[PDB]
Amino acid sequence: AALKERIELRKVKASVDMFDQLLQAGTTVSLETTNSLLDLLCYYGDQEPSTDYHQFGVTWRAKNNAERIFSLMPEKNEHSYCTMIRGMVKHRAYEQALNLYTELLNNRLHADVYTFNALIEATVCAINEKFEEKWSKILELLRHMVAQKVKPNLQTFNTILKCLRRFHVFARSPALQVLREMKAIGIEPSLATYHHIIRLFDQPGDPLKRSSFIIYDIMNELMGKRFSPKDPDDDKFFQSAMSICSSLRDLELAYQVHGLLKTGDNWKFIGPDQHRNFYYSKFFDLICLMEQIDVTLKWYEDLIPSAYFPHSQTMIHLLQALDVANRLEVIPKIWKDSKEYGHTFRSDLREEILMLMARDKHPPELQVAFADCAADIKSAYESQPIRQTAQDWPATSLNCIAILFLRAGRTQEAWKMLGLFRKHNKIPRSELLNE
Amino acid sequence: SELLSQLQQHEEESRAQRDAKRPKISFSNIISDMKVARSATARVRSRPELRIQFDEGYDNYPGQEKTDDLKKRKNIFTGKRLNIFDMMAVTKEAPETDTSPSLWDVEFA
Amino acid sequence: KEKDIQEESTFSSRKISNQFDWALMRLDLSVRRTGRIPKKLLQKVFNDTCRSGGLGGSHALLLLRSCGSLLPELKLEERTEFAHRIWDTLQKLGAVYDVSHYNALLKVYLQNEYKFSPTDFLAKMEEANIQPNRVTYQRLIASYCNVGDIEGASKILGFMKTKDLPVTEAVFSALVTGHARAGDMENAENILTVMRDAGIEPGPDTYLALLNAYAEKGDIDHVKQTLEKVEKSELHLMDRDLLQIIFSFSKAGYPQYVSEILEKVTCERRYIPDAMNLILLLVTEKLEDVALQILLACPVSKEDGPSVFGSFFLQHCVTMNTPVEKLTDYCKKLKEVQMHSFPLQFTLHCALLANKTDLAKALMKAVKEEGFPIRPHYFWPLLVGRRKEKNVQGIIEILKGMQELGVHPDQETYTDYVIPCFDSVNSARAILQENGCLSDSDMFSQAGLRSEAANGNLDFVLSFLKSNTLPISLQSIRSSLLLGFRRSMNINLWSEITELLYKDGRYCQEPRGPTEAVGYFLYNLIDSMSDSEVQAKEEHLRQYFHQLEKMNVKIPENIYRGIRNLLESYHVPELIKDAHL
Amino acid sequence: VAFVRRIPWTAASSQLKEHFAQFGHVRRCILPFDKETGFHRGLGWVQFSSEEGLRNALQQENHIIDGVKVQVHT
């Protein structure tokens, strides 16, 4: 009874030390208590769970407490074997888990649903063989699952789809058969199910096209479906769906994906921070490219800064969208916002703004505003924090600033820039000299 | 262009006459800085992945009407399924609250 | 497999016209696994593209791009001829060539060192009347830089200004190449400074061109300098860049520095295929000694030492006619490290597929020295090759080579190869008797007997047995005869030969039972004949067994039971009646 | 009849016989040498005189010929 406390507290070391002492004294330990000890040991791999204060490779170790205790067990029920198999698969002991399942079959003991789900991953990771072989192996486990009267849960199918990611070329059509099987049985595909598929159907990194059209069927199904957390991978769907919308460059599809995010409480599935930034980066980048400027600016105001903080590259995309739209009166505003979002000292962004402002001649009013922004960008170059290392004045930036001063009529300020050119050894273009 | 085509012929002739390298030092200052040098912004970051991107980097951005064909009337949900697991109409669930949740179930929740 | 489910419905209807993407993977997967696309494999995809007929601009573009550096096994000139042939074939199939198609052709030309006037290709573009783009102009500058023409390059750059095209890093990398290739290292260094002056930090590609530049001239001191700078700088370290420098040194003819640069190679995440490609290219360039150094520096497969990262080297060495000494030396090193349990045998296989006897003999003799058991099955495919060649003296040389090694052709060798090849079996033995090479020509005479027995010319079988003075095996004839009967069967023949037998019977004495075993012969024949076949042989069997009764040479009782059991399975009353008689 | 797979091109029907003779008296060893090449497809059939021989040939999981493990199936 006192040992059960340590198992409830998750004291892996104290429980084992006490369990051994209990066994040495000779007092009877209930199978249930020993099973709970294995669950604690198998889950954590005989390692203390992280406490407040006192990746690569297989974490399963041969000289581990679970193995020793497992053999010590006088009676081993189905649960004891199940948790041991699951522990091995969790800790990348794929070959050892499959070997234990063989022993499980020799004892004529039915495995539970969770053991079967872990075993599917083992067969794929354990051995290296052609898809045809691995598919035959997976199918064989499914046939064993039916023979043992074990009903497959949602995770059973999601693991197959996740496991089938390796075999991108060959698993596409088989993966659809798995999805079609889920619908017939009645297991409703969660977001994780579709997440795995859309990933599977767009694995190649070569410039390919029309393979990603899988998404259209999925979106029609998922339209207006309020989702609940079913699989640990439900949060990864939206980021993947938006990445495909950017690759296909279909703005209408992007609005359908975003629409689904906004229905009910679907916004809570966006995921961690880095997931949210990626989603919004891909989403907003597509808006600027494929939508009218008048609507792009509305999305710009709503999303930033309330939703996310823009990456320096997204500000460049917004500047390019303004150029294509011939709406360069807003460029001074973009600079102000850029500085507020920590892009004051981004060389790429500063160079792009100056080039666009100085590319063509503008009316006096627009030319004056560009001169003030250029003077501000110039001040940022003078007060660079990189100065501690090395202060660099890109030739283009220097030239654009000088020309913008000349066009606005601040000859006094432009005359000073001539000293900088020779100082920094930057060749002025003929256009600057001709003007 | 055709005018450029005429120029091309002058390029070969001039080079044949020069034989040795010309005194075209300073490289014409990048032909007076040429036009645009924004290409660096892709490589200022200089990541290993980015090199692979520029190593395979060519004018792949413009696909234009890459896939005009569509609407083959193929629905994925319709088609051949795996018949290993028999179809189950409905599930009857018993609460069984007394059953102690196994650590794995607690951690999964 | 029941039509393989119609090849899975002709492979799921060729992925609904996306087989081309599917094929792109098999290509890509090969590059992931090996880094090389087998010439055979590419021919298949291409042939499948013609077979399909429906080509896609991107799909045709891929094939062209596959003809470049992705074919390290083939020589630069062969790649171009291949690329030219594909381009023509693609045009015959109605491939609409856009700017991309012609751009890819330029890359292939540049990758395969295909020297051409940039004006000519520009003229080709003008005939197509398709506006060139920046990549075209940049690649035309690289063409002028690969030939060290700075003036031409500058003139195209001058037009580039009129078109207002951005200068990319590739342009600067091409500039470095030109001045380096022209031998003006100072100028190449000025590009490095001008790039820094323009604010474009030199990339690792630009440094690879710089590294390669030095390797061409063999300035290892500068190579070490620029290396250290790369190490110090933020620039990551790719072995595809380094492995390329060895190729430069190897191509430049300074393999002494290769060892130094190869020692710098640190095994990284996944550069096996790149080294795999480099090794292939080195053997193509006939630089196998350097390829061996790299081959030894590669990591052996953790699971099995006998990994095939030397097989691609050995096979391409055989295809390249690597010197037997060189090839054998490489095999020995692979055998020592357990990199191959049977390196020479594998080389013997592909060398046998090449159908070269001189090499096969030398390799086969090296198999005996290595201590692996020699078998006629090693010479068997080679004899097939010469059989197709129809070289009387050529095949004679094989037998001489076998004698040098000690192999002797048995009967199966003749029946399968020497017997079919020669127009006349008897003339073959006469030519073979002239040489005196065969340990025994009876095996050849018996070999022709097998064929004539198998063909069903039982009259020849009997007449042959008589004329020949040397002993023959009856049991083998029995098994060959029952096959011949299935092929050629005539009731009259069996009677005619029997009358011929009575005339001039030879040997007379037989260890095979006069009658008891003759029954065994009949029993074996009946067993071999399929039920349907025996049903067809209903009328003739009755007569043959009536001839057996009049002869009175009844078959054995125990064998009789066997036959009767066979006839019961056939369920034909006439056959059972034949047994009773 | 035992169905053998993954037979190395070096190993002929005779070699299959001697390795399989220890398990049962092989009545006939059928190794189909691919035409023209002269090398079998890597598969073969071994007819044992008795079913016991076939069973014994299936009991052993590791059938090694020329250092190559061949796969045997009923």
Curated annotation (Swiss-Prot), chain A:
Transit peptide keyword on record: yes
Keywords: Acetylation, Mitochondrion, Primary mitochondrial disease, Repeat, Ribonucleoprotein, Ribosomal protein, RNA-binding, rRNA-binding, Transit peptide, Translation regulation
Claim: Acetylation is one of the keywords in the record: yes
GO BP: mitochondrial translation; regulation of translation
Source domain of life: Eukaryota
Repeat positions for PPR: 1-29, 30-54, 77-111, 112-152, 153-189, 190-231, 234-268, 276-310, 311-345, 394-428
Tissues with expression: Abundant in testes, skeletal muscle and heart tissue.
Record note on quaternary structure: Component of the mitochondrial small ribosomal subunit (mt-SSU). Mature mammalian 55S mitochondrial ribosomes consist of a small (28S) and a large (39S) subunit. The 28S small subunit contains a 12S ribosomal RNA (12S mt-rRNA) and 30 different proteins. The 39S large subunit contains a 16S rRNA (16S mt-rRNA), a copy of mitochondrial valine transfer RNA (mt-tRNA(Val)), which plays an integral structural role, and 52 different proteins. Associated with the 12S mitochondrial rRNA (12S mt-rRNA).
Similarity section: Belongs to the mitochondrion-specific ribosomal protein mS39 family.
Protein name: Small ribosomal subunit protein mS39
Chain's gene name: PTCD3
Parent-protein start and end of this portion: 155 to 613 of 689
From Swiss-Prot, chain B:
Biased composition (Basic and acidic residues): 9-22
Subcellular location: Mitochondrion
Annotated spans, Disordered: 1-22
Domain of life: Eukaryota
Family statement: Belongs to the mitochondrion-specific ribosomal protein mS31 family.
Quaternary structure, from the entry: Component of the mitochondrial small ribosomal subunit (mt-SSU). Mature mammalian 55S mitochondrial ribosomes consist of a small (28S) and a large (39S) subunit. The 28S small subunit contains a 12S ribosomal RNA (12S mt-rRNA) and 30 different proteins. The 39S large subunit contains a 16S rRNA (16S mt-rRNA), a copy of mitochondrial valine transfer RNA (mt-tRNA(Val)), which plays an integral structural role, and 52 different proteins.
Record's protein name: Small ribosomal subunit protein mS31
Gene coding for it: MRPS31
Residues of the full protein shown: 175 to 283 of 395
Curated annotation (Swiss-Prot), chain C:
Expression sites (tissue/organ): Expressed ubiquitously. Expression is highest in heart, skeletal muscle, kidney and liver, intermediate in brain, non-mucosal colon, spleen and placenta, and lowest in small intestine, thymus, lung and peripheral blood leukocytes.
UniProt modified residues of type N6-acetyllysine: 92, 124, 163, 229, 400, 550
Effect of mutating residue 378 to A: Reduces binding to EIF4E
Outcome following mutation: residue 520 to A: Reduces binding to EIF4E
Localization of this protein: Mitochondrion; Nucleus; Nucleus, Nucleoplasm; Nucleus inner membrane
Segments passing through the bilayer: none
PPR repeat segments: 63-97, 98-132, 133-167, 168-202, 203-237, 238-272, 340-374, 375-409
Tree of life domain: Eukaryota
Clinical note on disease: Mitochondrial complex IV deficiency, nuclear type 5: An autosomal recessive, severe mitochondrial disease with multisystemic manifestations and early onset. Clinical features include delayed psychomotor development, impaired intellectual development with speech delay, mild dysmorphic facial features, hypotonia, ataxia, and seizures. Brain imaging shows bilaterally symmetrical necrotic lesions in subcortical brain regions. Mortality is high, due to episodes of severe metabolic acidosis and coma.
Protein name: Leucine-rich PPR motif-containing protein, mitochondrial
The encoding gene: LRPPRC
Included stretch of the parent chain: 64 to 644 of 1394
UniProtKB/Swiss-Prot annotation, chain D:
Chief location category: mitochondrion
Alphabetically ordered keywords of this record: Mitochondrion, Nucleus, Phosphoprotein, Repressor, RNA-binding, Transcription, Transcription regulation, Transit peptide
ATP-binding is among the record's keywords: no
GO molecular function, one term: RNA binding
Entry comment describing in which tissues the protein is expressed: Ubiquitously expressed, with highest level in heart, liver, skeletal muscle and testis.
Location(s), subcellular: Mitochondrion; Nucleus
Gene Ontology BP, a term: flagellated sperm motility
GO-annotated cellular components: acrosomal vesicle; mitochondrial matrix; mitochondrion; nucleus; perinuclear region of cytoplasm; ribonucleoprotein complex; sperm flagellum
Highest taxon above the source species: Eukaryota
Keyword Lipid biosynthesis belongs to the record: no
RRM domain span: 1-74
Protein's job: RNA-binding protein that acts as a nuclear receptor corepressor. Probably acts by binding the SRA RNA, and repressing the SRA-mediated nuclear receptor coactivation. Binds the STR7 loop of SRA RNA. Also able to repress glucocorticoid (GR), androgen (AR), thyroid (TR) and VDR-mediated transactivation.
Protein name: SRA stem-loop-interacting RNA-binding protein, mitochondrial
Shown residues in whole-protein numbering: 20 to 93 of 109
